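4.2 Preliminary Data

To establish feasibility before requesting continued support, the project team ran the inverse folding procedure on a target of 126 residues. The structure was first converted into the token representation described in Section 3, and no sequence information of any kind was made available to the design step. The complete token record follows.
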């Protein structure tokens, strides 16, 4: 079902949460080699989550589930906000700009925290 697909997509999102919080500890400790690897892992995780979400939104559209489509439009938009901040973070790491990396990291945390009530609302809607 689209609901199990959303639970499967949510689990991937939570994997990225885990690798992010590990990445944050490594950044604070100055273990740049670990950070590089975690950033690659996150890129792969976010790329998968985005594709899953897009499939869920298409299926909800084909099913005519207007409320779920509304929420998935809202949530996917926020996803891109978090994604763009992530990409700027990766660029800050490449550039050696730890001040920017810290800024983007905190912003990505807040964008993620805000979007959680909506994430829960989608599970119930599908």
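Position-by-position output of the design step:
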């Amino acid at each position: 079902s689209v609901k199990s697909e959303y639970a499967e997509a949510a689990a991937v999102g939570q994997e990225a949460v885990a690798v992010f919080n590990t990445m944050k500890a490594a950044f604070q400790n100055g273990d740049k080699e670990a950070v590089a690897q975690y950033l690659a892992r996150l890129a792969s995780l976010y790329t998968r989550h985005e594709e899953l979400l897009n499939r869920i939104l298409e299926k909800a559209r084909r099913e005519g589930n207007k409320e779920a489509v509304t929420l998935m439009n809202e949530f996917t938009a926020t996803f891109q906000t978090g994604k763009s901040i992530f990409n700027a973070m990766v660029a800050a790491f490449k550039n050696g700009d730890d001040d920017s990396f810290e800024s983007y990291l905190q912003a990505l945390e807040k964008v993620t925290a805000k979007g959680e009530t909506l994430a829960d609302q989608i599970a119930k809607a599908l």
